[PDB]
Amino acid sequence: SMNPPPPETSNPNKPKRQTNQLQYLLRVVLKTLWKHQFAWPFQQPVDAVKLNLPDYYKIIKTPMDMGTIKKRLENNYYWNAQECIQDFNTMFTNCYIYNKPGDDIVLMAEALEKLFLQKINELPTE
Ligand SMILES: Cc1c[nH]nc1CN1CCN(c2nc(-c3[nH]c(C)c4c3CCCC4=O)cs2)CC1
C-alpha cells in the first residue's frame, strides 16, 4: 500500500501575503486547536499504510491536516484568510466523510470544530 504525496506547503509560483487575519489564524486559531487533548490525529497527514486504511485515499481526494496548515501559515503560503479557513473545513469534512457518526475520531473532530467556530467568529476585520 502507498500514501499519496502530502499537500504542498511551499510554492514559489504562488503569491503570498501576511494579513492581520492570517496572523490571528496562526496565533489564536491554530494554537488553540493544536494544544487540545484531541488534536493528535489531526497533526499530520493520515498514514493510511500504518493505519491499514487502504481505502482512505480512495474516498478522500482532498486531504488536509493541521500539520500542513501550520506549515502553510508559518511559511506565509496563503493569500487570504478564506484559503486557510477552507483548509480547516476540508480537514473536518474529510473526517466526517470517511468515518461513522459517533466514532471516537468524529467526536474529536467535533470538539476541535466547536473551538474553531468560536475563534473564527471573532476574526478581526482586515
Ligand atoms: C505520536 C504523535 C503525538 N502527537 N502527534 C503524533 C504523530 N502522529 C501520530 C499518529 N497519528 C494518527 N492519526 C490517526 C488518524 N487521524 C485521522 C484524521 C484519522 C485517523 C484514523 C481513522 C480515520 C481518520 O480520519 C491515527 S494515528 C497522527 C500524529
Curated annotation (Swiss-Prot):
Secretion signal, residue range per the UniProt entry: none
Family: Belongs to the BET family.
Tissue specificity annotation: Ubiquitously expressed.
Connected disease: Cornelia de Lange syndrome 6: A form of Cornelia de Lange syndrome, a clinically heterogeneous developmental disorder associated with malformations affecting multiple systems. It is characterized by facial dysmorphisms, abnormal hands and feet, growth delay, cognitive retardation, hirsutism, gastroesophageal dysfunction and cardiac, ophthalmologic and genitourinary anomalies. CDLS6 inheritance is autosomal dominant.
Further comment found in the protein's record: JQ1, a thieno-triazolo-1,4-diazepine derivative, and I-BET, a benzodiazepine derivative, have been tested on tumors with success. Treatment with GSK1210151A (I-BET151, a I-BET derivative) has strong effets on mixed lineage leukemia and promotes myeloid differentiation and leukemia stem-cell depletion.
Bromo domain: residues covered: 17-123
Name of this protein: Bromodomain-containing protein 4
Domain of life: Eukaryota
Residues the record marks as site: Acetylated histone binding: N99
Record comment regarding domains: The NET domain mediates interaction with a number of chromatin proteins involved in transcription regulation (NSD3, JMJD6, CHD4, GLTSCR1 and ATAD5). The C-terminal (CTD) region mediates interaction and recruitment of CDK9 and CCNT1 subunits of the P-TEFb complex. It is also required for maintenance of higher-order chromatin structure.
Record note on modification: Phosphorylation by CK2 disrupt the intramolecular binding between the bromo domain 2 and the NPS region and promotes binding between the NPS and the BID regions, leading to activate the protein and promote binding to acetylated histones. In absence of phosphorylation, BRD4 does not localize to p53/TP53 target gene promoters, phosphorylation promoting recruitment to p53/TP53 target promoters.
Residues of the full protein shown: 44 to 167 of 1362
Glycyl lysine isopeptide (Lys-Gly) (interchain with G-Cter in SUMO2) crosslink residues: K58
Assembly and oligomerization: Interacts with p53/TP53; the interaction is direct. Interacts (via CTD region) with CDK9 and CCNT1, acting as an associated component of P-TEFb complex. Interacts with RELA (when acetylated at 'Lys-310'). Interacts (via NET domain) with NSD3, CHD4, BICRA and ATAD5. The interaction with BICRA bridges BRD4 to the GBAF complex. Interacts (via NET domain) with JMJD6 (via JmjC and N-terminal domains); the interaction is stronger in presence of ssRNA and recruits JMJD6 on distal enhancers. Interacts with NSD3. Interacts with NIPBL.
Compartment(s) of residence: Nucleus; Chromosome
Function text: Chromatin reader protein that recognizes and binds acetylated histones and plays a key role in transmission of epigenetic memory across cell divisions and transcription regulation. Remains associated with acetylated chromatin throughout the entire cell cycle and provides epigenetic memory for postmitotic G1 gene transcription by preserving acetylated chromatin status and maintaining high-order chromatin structure. During interphase, plays a key role in regulating the transcription of signal-inducible genes by associating with the P-TEFb complex and recruiting it to promoters.
